[model samples]
Target: MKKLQIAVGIIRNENNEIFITRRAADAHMANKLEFPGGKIEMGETPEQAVVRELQEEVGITPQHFSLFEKLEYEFPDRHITLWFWLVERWEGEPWGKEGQPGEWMSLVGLNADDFPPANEPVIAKLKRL
Candidate 1:
C-alpha cells in the first residue's frame, strides 16, 4: 500500500495539557479525537507541514516545535507515516477552524480508545514521559 505522510502538532500548554480535535463528521475517520494534522504537502518540511496544518485547521501558529517521534501505522485500507511534533510555544489558542470540536486535556485524560488506532503508540509514548 502507498503510505500517506502526515505531520501532527501536539500543542501543549504550560500545564502539559494537550490540545485535540474531533475528526469532521464527514471525514474518512470521523468522530474520533485526533491531534491536528494533515497530509504532508510537497516541498514542506514536517515541522512546516504541521505549522501550516495548525493554522489552517485550528488557527494556532506554533512558534516553536520539534519532532517527538515518527512512526508508521497500518490501518487496513491505508498505511500512514506520522510525524509527531511537540509544540512548546505558540501564538494563540486553538479552536476548530473547521466544524470539528476541539479541547484541551491532560495526556492521561486522552484515552487511547478515544482516538483512532494510529494514535495509540503516540499516547503510550507520552504516558512514559
Candidate 2:
C-alpha cells in the first residue's frame, strides 16, 4: 500500500499549553482530538507542508518552528508517516479555520487517553520536552 505523509504542528503559547482540535465528524479519526495538521501535498517539503497546513486548518502561520518528531504507523487499511513540528512562535491568532473547534491545553498534565492511539508516543515525548 502506498504510504501517506502528513505534517503536524504542536502549537504552543507562552504558558506552554499545546493546541488541539477535534476531528471533523466525517474525518478518518472522527471526533478524536489531534494536533492540527494535514497531509503533505505533492511538491511540498514536510516543513513547508507544516506551514501551509497550519495556515489552512488553524488560521495561523508559524513564525518559528523546528522539526520535533518523526513517526511511522500502520493501521489495517493504511500506513502513515507523520512529521511533527514544535511551533512556539506564530503570526495571527489561531482558530478552527475549517470549522473544527480547537483549544489549548496544559502539556504538564495532559490526558493522552482522549487522543488517537497513534499519539501515545507523541504525548510522551511532549511531556519530556
Candidate 3:
C-alpha cells in the first residue's frame, strides 16, 4: 500500500463561491470533483506544500490561509493524509493551472457524490455553513 500526504486548498472567490477542479478521466478518482493539491515531498511542511501546490494547481498564490482540518483516508491500495487549508485571500484568480477542469461553485450546490469518498468530512462542514 502507498502512503502519502496531500495539501488541499479550499479557495473562496469574491462572490463567496468555492473553487473546485476535476480529476482527469483517466486518473484515480476519474472525473470527480475535488480541491486542488499535490503530493507532499519529504522535507516539506504541509504549509509549504500548500503554497507551492496551489500556485501550480490553481494559478493562485494563497496570501492568507488557515488550516481547517486534517484527516486520513484509507483506500484499498493507498492511505492518504489530507491537510485542508482555507484560503480567504490570494494573489491571482484561481483557475485550472494544469488542464484540470476548474470552476467556481456555490457551497449550496455541492454534491457529495461528485467528490471522492475521502472528501466527505470537508463537504459536510461546507454544507453546514
Candidate 4:
C-alpha cells in the first residue's frame, strides 16, 4: 500500500499549549482531537503546506515555526507520513475557519480518549516539548 504524506501545524500559545480541533460527527475522525493542518499538495513543501492549511482551516497565517518532528503511522487502510511543526508566532488571531469546534490545551492536558485515534500519539509527543 502507498503511504500518504501530510503536513501538520502544531500551533501553540504562550503557555506552550497546543490548538486542538474536534472533527464534526459527520466528518472523518469525528469526536477526535487534531492539530490544525492538512495534506501536502503537489509541488508544495511541508512548510508551505502547513502555512496554507493554517490559513485555510484556522484563518491564521503562520510567519514563524519550527519543524519539530515527523511521524509515520501504518494502519490497515493506509500509511501516513506526517510532517509536524511547532508554531508559536503568526499573523492574526486563530479562528475556526473550518466551521468546527476547536480549543487550546496544554500538551500535558491532552487525553487520547478526548480525541480521535490519530491524535493520541501526536498529543503524547507534544507533551514532551
Candidate 5:
C-alpha cells in the first residue's frame, strides 16, 4: 500500500484578496495556481505543520487562524488528506520562497478556470464567506 500524505494549506488575505502561488513547471501539478503550503512532517500536529509550512514556504508567521475545513481523497494512484486552514491575521508581508510567484488575487476572480482542480470546490466556498 502507498503511504498517505498529509498536507496543510494556509491562505493569506490582503484586503479581502487571497494569495496564490504559481507552481514551477518542472514540479508536480506544474504551472498550477495554489494556496501556499506543503506536507506535514512526522510527529507534528496539523497546526504545527501548517505553521511550519507557512514559515518555510513564505516569510510570515501567522498570528491567528482557524481550522475551517478538512478534505481527503484518493488520486486513483495515491492517497492524501488535506487540512485546510483559513488564516486571517499574520505578522508580516509574505513572499514566495522556493521560486514560486505569489500574487494577491481577488476572491471574486477565484474560479474553476483560475485555480487547481482540487481547489475548485474550495473557491466556491470562499465566495460565500
Candidate 6:
C-alpha cells in the first residue's frame, strides 16, 4: 500500500468554533467537509505543513498552534497519516482560496458524518474535549 502524510489544522476561535472547508467538486473527497489543511511537502515539518496549507488553502497564517492528534487510515489504494493541530491563533480572515466552500461550526454541532470516514477518530477526540 502507498503511504502518505498530511497535516491538517483545527482552527478554532474563542467561541469554540472550528474552521472547516468543503472539498472541491473534483477532489478525492468531493463535497465532504474537513478541517482546513493539506499535504506535507518535502523538507517540511508537520507544523510548517499546516501553516503553509492554511495559507494556501484558507488564506491565513497561523500565529499559534500546538500538536493535537495523529491518526492513520487505510483506503484500499492509499494509506494516510494525518497530523492534526489546534490552531489557537492566526492572522487575517479565512476564506477558501481553492474555490471550495468554507464555514465555522461550533464543536458541539460538528458532525462526524459530514467528513470523510478517515476523520472519525479525530471527531471522537473533539467530542470528548
User: Each candidate: what lDDT?
Assistant: 0.87, 0.89, 0.89, 0.80, 0.73, 0.88
- TM-scores for all candidates? 0.93, 0.95, 0.95, 0.88, 0.88, 0.94
| Clashing residue pairs found in predicted model 3 | none
lDDT of 3: 0.89
TM-score of decoy 4: 0.88
Query: What clash count goes with each model?
Result: 0, 0, 0, 4, 0, 0
Candidate 4 least-lDDT 10 residues: 115-124
Q: 1-129, model 5: which lDDT tens digit per residue?
A: 454545545565766788778888886568888877777778987888878887887776765798766777666556667677887887677787666798787877776675556665677888888
- Between prediction 3 and prediction 5, the one with superior lDDT is 3
The TM-score between candidate 3 and the true structure equals 0.95
Which candidate would rank higher by TM-score, 2 or 6?
A: 2
Root mean square deviation (Cα) for candidate 3: 1.0
lDDT of 2 by residue, 47-102 (tens): 99999999999999997799888999886678999998999999989898988889
Angstrom error of the Cα, residue 75, model 5: value is 1.9
In model 6, where do residues sit more than 4 Å from their true spots? none
Model 2 misplaced regions, further than 4 Å: none
What's the CA RMSD for each of the models?
A: 1.2, 1.1, 1.0, 1.8, 1.8, 1.1
Measured with C-alpha atoms, the lDDT of residue 112 in candidate 2 is 84
lDDT of 3 by residue, 15-111 (tens): 7689999999898888999989989889999999999999999889897699988999998789999999998898988877798899999988888
Across 1-129, the per-residue lDDT of candidate 6 in tens digits comes to: 778899998989889889899887787778899998878989999989999999999999997688889989887688999998988899988987888789888999988999989999888888798
Query: What TM-score does prediction 6 earn?
Result: 0.94
Task: For candidate 6, give the lDDT.
Answer: 0.88
In candidate 5, which residue pairs get closer than 3 Å at backbone N, Cα or C atoms, i.e. clash? none
- For candidate 2, the TM-score is 0.95
User: How far is 43's C-alpha from truth in model 1 (Å)?
Assistant: 1.7
